[PDB]
Structure formats: structure tokens, C-alpha cells
Amino acid sequence: MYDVVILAGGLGTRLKSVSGDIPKPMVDISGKPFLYRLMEYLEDQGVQRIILSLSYKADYIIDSVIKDNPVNSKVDFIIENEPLGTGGAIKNACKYIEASKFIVINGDTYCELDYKKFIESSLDSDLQISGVEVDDVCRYGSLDIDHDFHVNSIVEKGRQGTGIINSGTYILSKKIIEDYPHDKFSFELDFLPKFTGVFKAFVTKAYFIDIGIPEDYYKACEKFK
Ligand SMILES: Nc1nc2c(ncn2[C@@H]2O[C@H](COP(=O)(O)OP(N)(=O)O)[C@@H](O)[C@H]2O)c(=O)[nH]1
Ligand SMILES: [Mg+2]
């Protein structure tokens, strides 16, 4: 099983009328932080090394895990004094990774993915994204892929009916990004438009929630009792 980088350094929730102070991955989900439930699932999947890539309120998150760590996997921390963006965060985490490939997950997402099958599907690529097929994709960003599942573009939310959720979970070869010329950048907005290698989606019907979406918060609290 690959090393996992969890991106958890962004600000609190930002909705049209509501702004949060707590980091989104630390929202309480029926007695445990959302992040803890993600980490527990990863440990169940065989993950032995988790890197938490932090910035906003990094000391709050670390202090929480020092006191109550839900897993026995190794847990490393990397603190960004100034937010490096999602892409800069990944580039920065490459320092810690000795292997040629690793997993990136957004800390505000919880997906009951089969990571062994995801790794197998990624063997012939340097970048693979997890796409989640749902009957109603309206509240999610989605993926525009062709009939070989090559990713053509990322689509903004606001689309009724079926679609493939842009999960933000990737398997990548660190060589594609470790030496990206900028230290601060967005993975989706700066890196992906430039990347010229093979980029396909692993598409499954896995359970998916994004804790930044209010309806998914209620779904999560109900799911975990
Ligand atoms: N370490 C780090 N993480 C970040 C940064 N920006 C965002 N993140 C994290 O990366 C994930 C995705 O962030 P973002 O794409 O901005 O959020 P979204 N999917 O648009 O709501 C979140 O879990 C967030 O905490 C950053 O500058 N540094
Ligand atoms: Mg969000």
C-alpha cells in the first residue's frame, strides 16, 4: 500500500452566507473529527503511513491528534507557514516520499474507495484520479472523460442528473510534480492544464461525502450513528 498525503491546510468552510472558523476536516462527526474517520478508513485499507499537509490552524490539528490519534499507522506532519495551494502542498509533500508513487486525498472528503483496486488501475499511468459515479451530481464538481476514461476537463458543479464526481483523490508519480517550477500553485487550476502525460479516471460507485457541502454534513452525522 502506498504512502497517503492528506491535504488539510485550507481555511474553514466558505459558503455564500456562512464562514466557518474550525478547519473543515475537524468538524465533529458523531463524536470524532471528520479527519479521524477518514484516517480510520485508510488504516482499515492497509495504509501504514499518513502525511498530514497542514497550514491553517495546523497546531490545533496536531494537538488534537497528539491527544487522541485514531490510528496506529505512522503519522507525519508538514506545516506550511504560508499556504502553498493544493499543488504546492503536493509538491512540498514529495520531500517526505521515498517511493516513486503515492496517494493524495482531500481532507474534506470521505470516500469508501477500494484503494487496492485504485492502485492496480493506476499502474500504467503517472496520474490517476478517483471518479465517483452518482445518480445526482448537481452539488459536486464533476469529470469530463472519454470512452477510454481519459480525463478531458474538470466541470463545475450545477449539473442535474448523473455524473462522475471530481473526488480530488489521486495516485501520482512524484516525478511529475516534485520539480514543478513554482512553490505555490493550484493542482486543479495550474498543474492539470499543463500536464501532458497520461491522465485517466478510476470510476467506481463508492460512498462519497464532501464535508464542505451542508447536505453531506447531515448525511455523515447520520451515517456514523
Ligand atoms: N496544505 C494545504 N492544504 C490545502 C491548501 N489549500 C487547500 N488545502 C486542502 O486541500 C483540500 C482541497 O482544497 P480546495 O480544493 O481549496 O477545496 P474545495 N474542494 O474547493 O472545497 C482541502 O482538504 C483543503 O484543506 C493549501 O494551501 N495547503
Ligand atoms: Mg469545498
Numbering used by the authors: 1 to 225
Study text:
Here, we report the crystal structure of YpHddC complexed with guanosine-5′-(β-amino)-diphosphate (GMPPN), a GTP analogue, to elucidate the structure-function relationship of YpHddC. The phases were obtained by a molecular replacement method and refined to 1.55 Å resolution. The extra densities were well matched with one magnesium, one GMPPN, and two citrate molecules. Ala8, Gly9, and Gly10 experience an induced-fit conformational change when they interact with GMPPN in the crystal structure. In detail, an oxyanion hole-like conformation was induced by the three rearranged backbone nitrogen atoms. Consequently, the induced oxyanion hole attracts the O2′ oxygen atom of the ribose moiety of GMPPN. L6 contains Glu80 which is a key residue to interact with GMPPN. Two oxygens of the Glu80, Oε1, and Oε2, make interactions with N2 and N1 atoms of guanine with the distances of 2.84 Å and 2.79 Å, respectively. It means that the binding of the base portion of GTP follows a lock-and-key mechanism contrast to the triphosphate portion requiring an induced-fit docking. The stabilized citrate molecule plays as a tridentate ligand and seizes a six-coordinated magnesium ion.
The carbohydrate glycero-manno-heptose and its derivatives participating as building blocks of the core region are essential components of LPS in most Gram-negative bacteria. d-glycero-α-d-manno-heptose-1-phosphate guanylyltransferase (HddC) is the fourth enzyme involved in the heptose biosynthetic pathway and produces GDP-d-glycero-α-d-manno-heptose, an activated form of monosaccharides acting as glycosyl donors in glycosylation reactions. Nevertheless, YpHddC uses guanosine 5′-triphosphate (GTP) for catalysis rather than cytidine 5′-triphosphate (CTP) and uridine 5′-triphosphate (UTP). YpHddC is structurally and functionally related to GalU.
